[PDB]
Each structure stands twice: as structure tokens, then as C-alpha cells.
Chains A and B, each alone.
Chain A
Amino acid sequence: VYSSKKDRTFKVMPVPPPPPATTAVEQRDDFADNRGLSATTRTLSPTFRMFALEDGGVLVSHPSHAQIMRWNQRVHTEEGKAANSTVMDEYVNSRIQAIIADNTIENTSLSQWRKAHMWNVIKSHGKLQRRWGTP
């Protein structure tokens, strides 16, 4: 198939398993015209609500990117509202807020700030220190 040497072009992964039927409205079939093959029913699928335009298209009304980054941060933070805290947890919900507000991606880096401000963090023999106002 197409230069039989070997095929290393990235192949598509098989389709995830559909959700349980739980309805008996023919949620089983594939060669049935009452629905397409894809079965996406996620946590926040019912917020993507659609209105039938007159031309033939649909006007899907969905929540804004600055809202699902709010919904997620809510979910991610009240994992435990008084429970354990993970280094990976804080660093994630530190970005979900930074994504919540004006999500242009910083253009430079995410750690150049810390790397330069580790002299008021670290105590290093105050004769060789870094006080904002150098005496």
C-alpha cells in the first residue's frame, strides 16, 4: 500500500466505546437512519443547544470559552474544598484562572518570572542578597 517499504504515517485510532443504551429507543443500530454513527454525550453536552434556522442550518448556542474554563476550575478546585492539595493541582488551577481571563498564551514562557525572582524567595547570606531597594 503506497510504497510498500513500510507505513509510518500516523494512523487513526479506533473509536471509543459508546455510552450505555439505557433507553431502548434503538440506541443499538448503525445501519439505521434515525441517527448518525457518532455518539457524543458528555458532561456538558446539554449546554450546546441548537435552534433550527430557516435556511437549513442550525444556530447552536454554546457557552463561551471563558465559561467552560470557569466550570472546569469550579470542578477542579472543589475536588476537595477542604481536602488534600497537589503540586500538580495548584499549578493547574493557577493556569485555569490565567486561561479564564484573556487566554492569549503569554508569548514568552511560564517560568521566566520565578527563575528571576528567586532571590527574595531564597535567603543567601544577606551580604550577598537582593533587596528591592539596594542599600
Chain B
Amino acid sequence: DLVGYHVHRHFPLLDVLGCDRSVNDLLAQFWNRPQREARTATVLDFAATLQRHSNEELTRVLYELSSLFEWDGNGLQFIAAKVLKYGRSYTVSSELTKAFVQLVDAMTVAFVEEQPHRLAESPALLAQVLHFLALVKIMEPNKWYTLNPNAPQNRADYTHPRGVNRTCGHVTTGRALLDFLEDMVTSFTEGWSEDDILDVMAGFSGVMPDGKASSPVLYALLDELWMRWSKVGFVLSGSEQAVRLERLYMLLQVMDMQRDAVLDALLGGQLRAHSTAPSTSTLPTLFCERDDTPPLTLAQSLTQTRGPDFFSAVSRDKRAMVKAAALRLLTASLAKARDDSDAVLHQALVESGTELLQSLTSKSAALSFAQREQFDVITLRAVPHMADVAERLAEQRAEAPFFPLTASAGGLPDTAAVLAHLSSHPAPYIVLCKGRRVHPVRTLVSNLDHVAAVENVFLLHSSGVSKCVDALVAVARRLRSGKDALIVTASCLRALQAAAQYGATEKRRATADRALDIVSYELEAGRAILMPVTDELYLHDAGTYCDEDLMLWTLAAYLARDVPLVKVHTIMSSRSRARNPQHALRGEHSPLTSTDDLYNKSTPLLQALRSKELRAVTHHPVVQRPVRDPPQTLYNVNPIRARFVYRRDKALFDKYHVTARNLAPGFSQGALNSDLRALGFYTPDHPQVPYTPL
């Protein structure tokens, strides 16, 4: 039926079409019809009715549309085409980018000007407008137009009076609202519970382009989280209240606020101790901000066995005692978790744990704890199709049987060419498991001899296996030349497991399965080389957090110095910001760092990111894309066909005349892909057919 809206009250004067659809029936339409032309006539149809809908529906539809977004990068990046009128290219935002810029333009009128009472009432709404306004990166509209991070467009930022970029000129979508939301956090929050004081503190950090949150905004909640504490007296021991500290300490780490007191308590009070009984030394633990933060300890209660948030957080604190202080709380957390026999706490505590060890200066103490806690075992149990290999990689002795791992001064694995000695044993082939899974798993340190005999070794990155797997697949073939190789890391595996389930679209998560099917079933066949956690600790420089974006590089900066004969390639997408580790990812400028940083034996392997040489010696071949075959554009709008929808054609047919051959009724210009029928339009004098699938 063609029902759903009603014309304005006073008809012959205003003909505007109201709205009367239920929020459900907008979401059902939003979901069953994910095409862009239906996903526009849903956002717009909803933003017109944004002043009637209840504070709860405002929570839902906002929280709902985020399913279409993704924290990772470009927010509203629904582009139409990259026009090539001139030499370089520019990007044209589709009708769906202009629909949220329209939606957010209706939120900044309802919540700022005509109903300023709407957002104080329901505290969980603001804690959803904020997080929505972060996913849509409205503090940086340039990326709604930017395709390649390396190629930053200024379409939404820079206009010239000659008449370029006028209509998409200077965009200020929520900068009115986003700054009214902070006028509401300073001076009310009585009806805010600590779970929301944290989230609101997490909104203003995320939405900012770098996570700084305009400290008076933040400081207005910290000033309110103490009043929520003073009524308990800073002796909180609700176990879930001992979590809201591990989150309050991860934030104020992204922000970078350095408050020892929250660590003086979350850790257990070890600092503010080891500051007693001094003969003669410093008092580092205090870093007192007493007038700002309240004295806090937890209790004689748990005071131990923290959660994952805490360990990835203490990584950033460069203090020597805090790590040894937090290296037992990782043992206890790996004791309590193992004895509790839980999987999720057993993997979460490891992938958030390596971030802690990756900061200690003593790489030996870092490597000792990595094998006593079976890190190479528990991590890989999680990853979807890795459970098979984790078994074999956890063979009873050679899980990590204290390989030579001869680290020299500076921490660099100067074992190369003196672990190539191997102690002369040839790192044996086939072992056991009569089913002929007998070929042993290829840990790097055990198989560094092979990489020397290799002709051209490959490195994998989680991007090259996203958007398609047709590029890895080729290298899967070339593995059986004997001359080639392939190195995946336990980091690249984990960073594939995220996008394996936490993917924006199923067309992408389906890949990271087929992208992990191969690598987990090319590792079990003894072709690829898994650099495990025990070796990502070996190669990385001590003190630096080296995620999968730098394990791809510190490996290519290790082996481009410690085995220079062989090639190195990088399976990744040309859109990765890690295609140029000099431009991005470079360190703080320093006078001592040279351009010879790569080959000098005394420098850390990431000192070479301040050079265009590391990118020079590491090649980046696009091995093989899918075919360049054009997609079926017969069903899209065509400026050439458009002139034929209504073109009189009587003298064209003779016997089989139809009513109007070209005109697909209900569609836009006979374009079976640009569907519009049953979406809310207004044409009180022209017919329209109701919705049917195709």
C-alpha cells in the first residue's frame, strides 16, 4: 500500500508530507533493504521525525545506524565515483553521505535550539549521541571523501572562490552540537551512574581527532566520579567497581592523563610503598597530584588478579618498578584464570599481556615469562581455524624448548648467523602423529636456516587478505617452489581474527575466514612460517609497542640486516597506512638518528623508520589482483541511457508494442539498481507502484 505519511495540516497552503511510520517499520526497511537508495530514504525519513520520537527511540535508531559504521577509519565514506576530468582524481560523496550530514543537521537543531531539555533527561542517550558522533568522524570530514589514507582529500575542507568545492565547502555538522554536549557536562549529572560517567568520558575522547577530550570536559566528570566515591570513602571493593577503575585507567591512557593515584590503588598500593623505608633514592611512585585526585586504595579485598584492560594500560607507563609490580599481577591473573578454567579470560589476558612484556627493557625476563605461560599455546587456541596448529605447535617439548635465543648488548637478536649455527642440529623434519601431519610446524627461530636458503620471503599483513584473498592465494601456490617462503605472525593472525568476526560487512568477514583457512592450513602443512609470540618478543625492540602494523615492519627491518641476500615482500593493500612507515609511524625527531640506522648493528630495528631506505629495501609488489573484468553496470544509471527512458520510439517496433518499454516503473531512470519505490517520496499527481523484490 501507498500509506505511511500524511500531508501537512493546512493542505492548499502547505503540501509538506508528514511522517507516521513506526520506528520499527523504519528499521525493518533499513535492514531488509541495504541498498544505498533505500538506506538513504530511511535516514532522511527518520531525521525528519527526530523531534517527535521518544528519548528511548532516539537511543535505538542512533545505536542502530552505527551497525553501518566502523570505528576503524573513514566515517561517512559512501562515495559515488572518482571522477577523472583532470589529471588527478577527486571523490564524490553519495546521497548517503549527504543523508547523515542531513541527519546530524537535524540532531543539532532538536538538541541545541528547539529542545535543549531533551538530552539531560535520558543519560544513556547523550552517551549514544557522543559515540555515534565519533563513529561518524565529524571532527574530520575530510576522510568522508578520502579513499587512500596516503592520498588525503580536501574536498570537505578547502574551497576556492572561482567556484570549486562550493556546495561541499566548509562542513560544520555537529561542531555546534558537539560543543553544546560539553556545555552539558560542565554545568545535573546527579542522574548519571558510573557506567555512564565513564562512557561520556569515552565519548569526548573518541570523537576528537586524536583523543584529547578538552580536559575541562573530562575534568567535570572526574570531579563527579569522586563525589560518587566520597560517599563510600575511597574504599570501594565491589568487584564490578574494581572494573570501572581498569576502564578509568585505560582512558586517561588514551587521553594520556597521568594520575598515579588510580594506579596507586588498581595495582594494589605497591607504589606509595617502595617509597617507604628509603635509605637514599627518589620517590617516583608519588608524582603527587593530591589536590586534584583523591587518596585511594581498594581494600584488604582482591587487590590482585586484574583484567585485560589494566595490562594493556600499564604498558604506557615507562616506570621500571611498575612493570615488575605488574608482572606478578599477570602471573596471578594467569593463575586465577587457569585455575578458574575459562577460555575468554585466558586469551584476553595474553593478547593484552604481550603488550606489557613488549615494554620491559630486559628482553630475557620478557622471554622467560613468555614460555612459562605457554603464550604460543593459549593465544592461538582462539583464532578460528588455528586450534589444529596450536595443538601441534604445543607439542610436549618443542612448544618452546628454550631455543638458543642468544640476545646481545642492546637487546637486538644478534643471534643471527650465530643461531644460523643452530648448534649444528638441523631442526628435524617429520616427527610423529601417524596421520602424516608429521611435518613439524615452522617456528621462525627453528627455521631461520630455511629463510636463508629461501629466494624471496614474503610477509603477510591483515589488509592484503581483506577486500579479497586472490593475492595471498597466489603466494600460497608459489610456496611449493622451494625457493620462496611466507611469514605470518601471531600478531597478524590475531589482527585477522578481529576482522574475522568484528567486520562491517559479511562480504568482508567471510574473507578473513577464507583468508585464515589457508594460512592456518598452509602452516599445518609446513609451508608457511609462523612467527609466534615467543619470537615477536625476540625480534621487537624493548620498550616499543609493536602491533601487527610494526611486526610486519620490524621483521622486514630485522631480516633486511641480519640476512641481506633474500628479497622481502609485503602482502598488503595499497590503502594501508603501513605502506609508508616513514611518513606515518615515524618516531620523534632526534639528532642522533641517522640514515644509516638500518644497517648499524647497535641501533634498534625501528630506528630505521626515520629513513626512506627501509621502504627501499623492502619491496611491495601487488602479487595479483582479481581480474579487471567490469561489473554488471547495465543495471545502474547511465547518462547515455537516461535520454532513452522517455524517448518516443513508435517506429521502432512493429508487432509487439508495449506501453512504455524503457521506463521501469518505480525506479529512477529505468535503473534496476537504483530502486526507489515504497520509499517515502511525495508526488501527489504521479502514480507509484509498491515495493517488490527483484
Contact = CB atoms under 8 A, between A and B. Distances in A.
B291 interface: yes
A85 B66 CA distance: 33
Nearest to B546: A108
A110 B584 CA distance: 11
A90 interface: yes
Contacts of B216: 84-85
Interface in A76-92: 77, 80-87, 89-91
A106 interface: yes
Interface of A: 70, 73, 77, 80-87, 89-91, 93-94, 97-98, 100-102, 104-114, 116-125, 127-135
A128 B67 contact: yes
Contacts of B504: 128
Contact of A85 (B219, B315, B585): B219
A108 B609 contact: yes
Contact of A108 (B219, B287, B587): B587
Contact of A90 (B258, B343, B344): B258
A110 B549 contact: no
B348 A132 contact: yes
B282 interface: yes
Interface string B306-347: 001100100111111000000000000000000000011111
A88 B526 CA distance: 52
B513 to A, nearest CB: 14
Contacts of A91: 212, 256
Given A98-B318, A108-B585, A134-B497, A121 B205 contact: yes
B502 interface: yes
B536 interface: no
Nearest to A101: B318
B353 to A, nearest CB: 10
Contact of B498 (A105, A113, A121, A130): A130
A110 to B, nearest CB: 6
B590 interface: yes
Contact of B251 (A94, A113, A121): A121
Interface in B86-145: 127, 131, 134-135
A3 to B, nearest CB: 28
A112 B135 contact: no
Closest 7 CB pairs of A and B: A82-B291, A133-B344, A132-B348, A133-B348, A132-B308, A125-B66, A81-B291
Contacts of A102: 318, 320, 361, 543
B287 A90 contact: no
B250 A117 contact: yes
A118 B70 CA distance: 11
Contacts of A117: 250, 253-254, 312
Given A109-B588, A114-B210, 16 more contacts: A81-B289, A81-B291, A91-B256, A94-B256, A97-B317, A101-B320, A105-B587, A108-B609, A112-B585, A113-B545, A120-B250, A121-B205, A121-B211, A132-B352, A133-B345, A134-B347
Contacts of B291: 80-83
19 contacts: A77-B287, A80-B291, A81-B291, A85-B215, A91-B212, A94-B256, A100-B284, A101-B319, A104-B543, A107-B541, A109-B587, A109-B588, A113-B315, A120-B247, A121-B251, A128-B66, A132-B309, A133-B346, A134-B344
B382 interface: yes
A107 B544 contact: yes
Contacts of A87: 212-215
Nearest to B66: A125
Interface in B48-70: 63-64, 66-67, 69-70
B361 A134 contact: no
Contact of A124 (B69, B215, B282, B544): B69
A121 B590 CA distance: 31
B71 interface: yes
Contacts of B316: 113
Contacts of A77: 287-289
